[PDB]
Design a protein around this ligand. Structure first.
Ligand SMILES: CC(=O)N[C@@H]1[C@@H](O[C@H]2O[C@H](CO)[C@H](O[C@H]3O[C@H](CO[C@@H]4O[C@@H](C)[C@H](O)[C@@H](O)[C@H]4O)[C@@H](O)[C@H](O)[C@H]3O)[C@H](O[C@@H]3O[C@H](CO)[C@@H](O)[C@H](O)[C@H]3NC(C)=O)[C@H]2O)[C@H](O)[C@@H](CO)O[C@@H]1O
Ligand SMILES: CC(=O)N[C@@H]1[C@@H](O[C@H]2O[C@H](CO)[C@H](O[C@H]3O[C@H](CO[C@@H]4O[C@@H](C)[C@H](O)[C@@H](O)[C@H]4O)[C@@H](O)[C@H](O)[C@H]3O)[C@H](O[C@@H]3O[C@H](CO)[C@@H](O)[C@H](O)[C@H]3NC(C)=O)[C@H]2O)[C@H](O)[C@@H](CO)O[C@@H]1O
Ligand SMILES: CC(=O)N[C@@H]1[C@@H](O[C@H]2O[C@H](CO)[C@H](O[C@H]3O[C@H](CO[C@@H]4O[C@@H](C)[C@H](O)[C@@H](O)[C@H]4O)[C@@H](O)[C@H](O)[C@H]3O)[C@H](O[C@@H]3O[C@H](CO)[C@@H](O)[C@H](O)[C@H]3NC(C)=O)[C@H]2O)[C@H](O)[C@@H](CO)O[C@@H]1O
Ligand code: NA
Ligand code: NA
Ligand code: NA
Ligand code: NA
Ligand code: NA
Ligand code: NA
Ligand code: NA
Ligand code: NA
Ligand code: NA
Lengths: 599, 599, 599
């Protein structure tokens, strides 16, 4: 019985105390230790070499203890390790082995979940240094790494990056790198107070699947001018996405460098999230250099039902090439988003846009293969002073994009800067159901609402419909002479255009093309013959050889005659129609006409 | 060894029994009590003064015990208290201190989560009395209250309000008032069986952030005529919302008073939820009196992808003023919802509507600043007998609202009651892509589909497109003489209109305005001169001085002549065009024309 | 003290060791066994008759132990049973009693939740046999069954069906049958590796409510030619749905037989999910034979924001009748989905379609009552070789369907096979805002883009708008002479049509109907009189008696004359207009005209 009291006080004591669930005689006869062994916490490993528990705190490095817990649970085929509530667990050194090549702190392992209820906080050892807090690669070379499967991080807890700035722009910092990750997720966690490159990365160059970020918060994760670039979540495996998250930045630097999400492989999504204070909402890009695991096509890309205040662009599309692989982006949907450019001076952040068709990372605009994109049922607003705001900034080659039933209230509808890139554009479709707002009315001196600064446009539709007047704009739509236009439909509805000097402008007379279909208002001077009765009226100018029909948009103030209601043309480029002289006489009128070609 | 058996049976016994996780010699040498101390339940506090456990039941008030648990866990920096499954925990008295000013029962505290697995039920002490079950304010004056942070209530359990009716209409009742709440949430909980004002309130007058209601059920929470008003969730802090919830009412009273959600600050949302039996779906409102914590603008407001059967209005917009603050509502999106007015007699509940632009709480219609709203891709249905159903009831001043690509199948498209308010309307946009259903065909004697009972309309677009005949309606669109109309576009497509006596009606001849752009069908009597050959035809009536062109919508049954295909006007208000007399003779025809002005 | 050591080692030992939470003197004086009794796992029942624990494994049938755990927890009013992580629990025999009529393995019980953290795996006893793993019916006759309430299955674990093929096509296999289920759910679970009929079924013939499938994965659940049919989730109770799930198949058989979801009662939804490798996305159907619990109407049906690669049809609509009940489907929304037909040969799987209006299970096309459906803001793509691809295959009677603001890029827009069914169509609305893609340009020899192979069409709108040329197609829209057409609007925009031989084709001259409203381009030969001055031009053909107006789509290459800009008709079916001869002479021209009737 000495050994009994001794047994009981020893670490095997619980293993000698019997238990049977709820005194049920049909239940297993267990020992207390068996029941305790059903759960596991950091406290079961956070101990000195003699086994005595250590309290966490700013003067204690918890890293080795958490790694020991992960390693052991892994050896039993997995489980969930709780990081207890009511404590802050500090990390204060780098991990070792395969994660060292990633500046890793903790190595995640398959089937080992982390239930973070307390706080995890970086110690000042990491100030001005690279780091990746949680790393799922098991090799410094990602190509030589094994997979991470079935690893979920969740809870009501917090990862706090300590506020430390980057030491050099070339450094990288991350919260969770799942690695070559299959069925991994982060749910519920707040990531805050840092200067980092990413908070979470999913996948590696297309290897991975079914990775998700849900109900997480990301708060103040850029804080310095050193930080080169930031994307809060980088989605680099298929069948993965981000939903119902909150993203907020307060620093000036974030308004110039930070993006919330990057979707970089097929079957990926960004849904139901709120963004504030960022430069950009989401990249949707196929990088040829990332094509190894899931092919060279990014398809089935969804950005839906988000709420955003940003300073640059909401969605940025891209694809590129390497020496041996060509990336392609197609089958994209952008719907249900409500987006605004936050209050800022014109030109004070990257050019404001709902959609950007951006060049590659070396600035090339002639490598892209972007098509089959639907942008529908979104709202976009930019304040009236923001000259640099567009529904779409179309800066690189575009093989198709369709806009239906959006409401865009900003300076430009379609824009690209003159003198810059000259994109080749195919299959740009702007349906009449896009509503153009009035916030920027009166602000558009010298500007074209649709400024078509492209090398060429083919197979495209622009149906312009105003909903209020803006007589400040130079034109509704302008094509420079350098832009070829063919097999396209361009229309300007007459409503709110009566007083406009120019409506559609074709500086190379491109509307004359055999397969150009256009209509727009114009003012035309006519003169009739003197005959009483049915009598022809003819335009005094001769630049209408392309017109197939025209009709009156003006009332007739006269009693003694009427000009024609409708007109066609003649070989010399005059318009002609048949009016009526109740009394004879040569007549001379100025009329507003709808000019039509093949429509 | 006497003291050893004694120690073991004492409440410190577990603190003497050793344990080491899974017999791992690298694990902490702990005591059983340390492992048990990692969790906490109501059972750890639900005890008499001698420490003996008390069983819950209808004759036991569990309030003080649950408060003791919350208070203690709070003192250790937080955690999660389980409310065990398999029991009903009754509450039977008011709390004390700061929550007493709120009729509070339990005080929530920061970082203390409640995992409700069992049932919490109100005892009859609360019958006919006010109460707020869970309160996160710490002061009777909300202005003087501290914050509630990091408080989550979740589980598979239930809050049951006991079925008790209100005692007086002036009383207030609530389930969860998070208070000045930051990162708080309710997930998974069923709230049922009550007569209450709210189930959950988030925030206080704009103070709070990141508060959410997810996957909760709200069932039968209004049951009496005493109940003054009900909104199941009131969202009164930014960056907060409701998603994937279920709301159901069965009482008659709920069909007249209850709303599912109120969104009252910026960056708030209501998504993916199902409603049945309610008067209203969601208020979206900026009250100047609520502007203290987050400014006087409600912007980035999202109502998306909900399913509803309601008896009144789906979304209600509003903003108002106090003596020193002016509220503004802008940047709203309503998309993807499928909504119907449930089976009821006409006029038996508040006027049916998809969108309502409602007056302030004192009935004023001249204080609102509502603009930049997008309503797109929704469906609305009301049964054919429901005279009082509209796509939009526009009852107060409106500074903009845009409708694109909806399907509305109800009695009216645009409505406001004559003789009532006379709203000032700007920037109302009804795109042609809105599909008008046929359920109410033949029901519209004496009614105008678009009944424009406003003081004035400016910068507005109404493109009417029918998809079946309804010859019962008096007109497609009518403007009384009291409504000014300027800088607007009004069109009536001809399809299904051939037999209509009136299509567009302008009782003050407002279509003549300099910047009014309109087109609609009309029947016109013409008579020609007798000349053989090209010969003029002229209208017999003189009310066409505003017409810029017209064209035939009718076949010509004649062989010996043809009327003009197109017409323009003359100063006296006749139409004129040039037809053709194969044989001479004065001709007299009645023709269906499309009348156009500036289009 | 002998009995004390004995007590302590006995199964009542923990019941003698005292504990008080965190040494708090205000806490309950408990015993260790009380605290352990707050949780329950499979280990508490997975024991031999002497109470000794049994290890799970491929040679152990865990079924009776799990049932014992469920039965006991049920007797205490519920709770959550954990299925521990780090182990595979095999099932190797059928259950007994009420579930035997369902081939049941485990019986679920009300208020008893399963937290599946480990793996559950079927033993080879089930090879070639029927089975339903988890069954919530309590009677072999579902009509005589009690309800299952408040039963949630959740966790990070897995249900593995062992890879076994069906033994006979008449067998049924299921993962979870909740039965007559109220407030039940499955969250987080992976179902994999099987040949089954369903993974999860919710409800029974309309009995049930508030059942949900969320964040689950379904992987490779069809593997043989024996498998008759598969729907991964069958939703057979109202106020229930599927959200944020992943569905994947790899077998050839799945491309011909498998559907992801079946929505079969009102107020049901399918949202935010990703599908790959399936034949079909979702059925949306009211079967009269399923109408018992919730009525004969399926209404408030939502399919939104999904991502899919399928081989057959995305959404399939249906309703049918029994001898005494008639099923109805109305108030449906399909929005925000991005869908493609995967790479396959033409005709190698069921006919590709976004929407299918399908016959009943006996092939009848004359029993359906389907109306008030909105399809808006979706994208659909099929590769160019897939002849059998359509936006809508309209194969049974249709009482209404509305398409607004979609982007469809496939072979046909509207299709039904000639010689097959002859549907009666009412209220088909194809708005102009639907964008028709160009992938299948040049592939359409002998084909009509809109192939209207119906018995009749009434109250319908087809506004065709091309966005690129396809001169291979025989026509944009064709109506055989067998299809009646009335009270409808059919338009073909002229853009990209100049070179088309046929645009709209009415093989029975149906465009002449009194209430048919149509416009489309045509080429017409005209000849004038010889008179100098205003001079008539007349068509040489006489098939224009239905034309109310026409206008020029062609330039005039002549200086000495001009044909009319606009035309009307004469009784003999010629067109006539007034042109102008500067010099006299008989003129003869061929002109492209927009032919209009009542528009
Ligand atoms: C911040 C961001 O996401 N910006 C994108 C931009 O992305 C490119 O630039 C960023 C700049 O931070 C990344 O390039 C940096 O990081 C890579 C990857 O780091 C190495 O590999 C990882 C696995 C390892 O853990 C690290 O220790 C490193 O060894 C460096 O190779 C590169 O030199 C450096 O500038 C980003 O790289 C991608 O990062 C994701 C997420 O971690 C990885 O999954 C990919 O493998 C990696 N891709 C490549 C090709 O290496 C760059 O792709 C986008 O290009 C841009 C336009 O689309 O949007 C944002 O600007
Ligand atoms: C039921 C509902 O939400 N109805 C809205 C309507 O809201 C207004 O009317 C309701 C009627 O119940 C509320 O007014 C009642 O309650 C307030 C608040 O109670 C006091 O303050 C709270 C913090 C405290 O816990 C209580 O003990 C009280 O001291 C009373 O002041 C008022 O006299 C009474 O009629 C609602 O008030 C808002 O309530 C939310 C949620 O609790 C609070 O966050 C706000 O502070 C409070 N606002 C104000 C201005 O006090 C009223 O705003 C909407 O106006 C209407 C149209 O938009 O929609 C529904 O009808
Ligand atoms: C695979 C699938 O979902 N296919 C649908 C198709 O559904 C019909 O055909 C399937 C074929 O598997 C089902 O019919 C089979 O199963 C029923 C039901 O099984 C019996 O009842 C259940 C409760 C019990 O547990 C079992 O032991 C059986 O006793 C058999 O009666 C039938 O003979 C057999 O072919 C499907 O039936 C429905 O199944 C759901 C889900 O389990 C039940 O809730 C319903 O009660 C049951 N309905 C009926 C009327 O019995 C058939 O409805 C659809 O018809 C089709 C077109 O819409 O889509 C897919 O093809
Ligand atoms: Na590295
Ligand atoms: Na497209
Ligand atoms: Na060029
Ligand atoms: Na109060
Ligand atoms: Na708007
Ligand atoms: Na007025
Ligand atoms: Na059966
Ligand atoms: Na419809
Ligand atoms: Na027929």
């Amino acid at each position: 019985p000495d050994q009994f009291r001794a047994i009981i006080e020893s670490p095997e004591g619980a293993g000698h105390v019997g238990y049977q669930y709820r005194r049920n005689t049909g239940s297993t006869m267990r020992m207390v230790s068996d029941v305790l062994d059903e759960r596991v916490s950091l406290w079961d490993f956070h101990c000195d070499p003699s086994g005595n528990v250590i309290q966490p705190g700013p003067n204690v490095d918890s890293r080795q203890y958490l790694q020991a817990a992960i390693d052991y649970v892994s050896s039993n085929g997995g489980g969930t390790i709780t990081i207890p509530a009511g404590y802050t667990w500090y990390l204060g050194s780098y991990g070792v082995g395969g994660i060292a090549g990633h500046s890793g702190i903790i190595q995640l392992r398959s089937n080992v979940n982390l239930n973070i209820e307390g706080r995890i906080h970086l110690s000042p050892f990491f100030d001005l240094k690279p780091f990746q807090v949680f790393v799922g690669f098991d090799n410094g070379d990602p190509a030589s790494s094994g997979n991470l499967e079935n690893c979920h991080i969740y809870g009501h807890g917090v990862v706090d990056f300590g506020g430390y700035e980057f030491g050099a722009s070339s450094q990288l910092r991350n919260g969770v790198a799942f690695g070559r990750s299959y069925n991994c997720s982060v749910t519920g966690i707040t990531f805050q107070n840092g200067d980092v490159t990413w908070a979470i990365t999913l996948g590696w160059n297309g290897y991975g699947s079914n990775c998700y970020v849900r109900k997480c918060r990301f708060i103040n994760l850029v804080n310095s001018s050193v930080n080169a670039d930031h994307s809060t979540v980088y989605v680099n495996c298929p069948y993965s996405g981000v939903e119902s998250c909150y993203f907020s930045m307060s620093s000036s630097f974030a308004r110039n460098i930070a993006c919330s999400v990057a979707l970089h492989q097929h079957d990926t999504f960004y849904r139901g999230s709120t963004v504030n204070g960022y430069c950009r909402g989401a990249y949707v890009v196929m990088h040829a250099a990332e094509a190894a695991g899931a092919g060279s096509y990014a398809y089935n890309m969804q950005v839906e039902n988000n709420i955003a205040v940003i300073y640059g662009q909401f969605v940025i599309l891209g694809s590129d090439v390497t020496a041996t692989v060509s990336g392609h982006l197609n089958d994209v949907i952008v719907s249900g988003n409500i987006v605004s450019i936050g209050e800022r001076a014109a030109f004070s952040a990257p050019f404001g846009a709902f959609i950007d068709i951006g060049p590659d990372n070396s600035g090339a605009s002639n490598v892209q293969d972007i098509q089959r994109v639907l942008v529908t049922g979104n709202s976009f607003y930019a304040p009236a002073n923001i000259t640099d705001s567009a529904a779409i900034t179309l800066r690189a080659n575009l093989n198709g994009c369709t806009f239906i039933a959006n409401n865009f209230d900003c300076r430009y509808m379609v824009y690209n800067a003159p003198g810059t890139t000259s994109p080749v554009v195919q299959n740009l479709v702007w349906d009449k159901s896009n509503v153009i707002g009035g916030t920027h009315a009166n602000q558009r001196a010298g500007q074209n609402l649709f400024d078509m600064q492209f090398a060429s446009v083919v197979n495209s539709t622009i149906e312009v419909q105003l909903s209020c007047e803006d007589l400040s704009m130079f034109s509704c739509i302008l094509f420079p002479a350098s832009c070829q236009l063919s097999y396209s439909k361009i229309t300007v509805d007459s409503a709110w255009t009566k007083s406009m000097s120019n409506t559609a402008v074709f500086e190379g007379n491109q509307q004359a093309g055999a397969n150009v279909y256009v209509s727009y208002p114009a003012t035309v001077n006519l003169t009739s013959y003197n005959t009483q009765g049915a009598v022809p009226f003819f335009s005094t100018d001769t630049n209408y050889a392309w017109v197939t029909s025209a009709y009156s948009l003006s009332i007739n103030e006269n009693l003694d005659f009427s000009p024609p209601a409708t007109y066609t043309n003649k070989a010399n480029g005059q318009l002609v129609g048949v009016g009526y002289n109740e009394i004879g006489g040569v007549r001379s009128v100025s009329v507003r006409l709808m000019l039509q070609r093949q429509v």
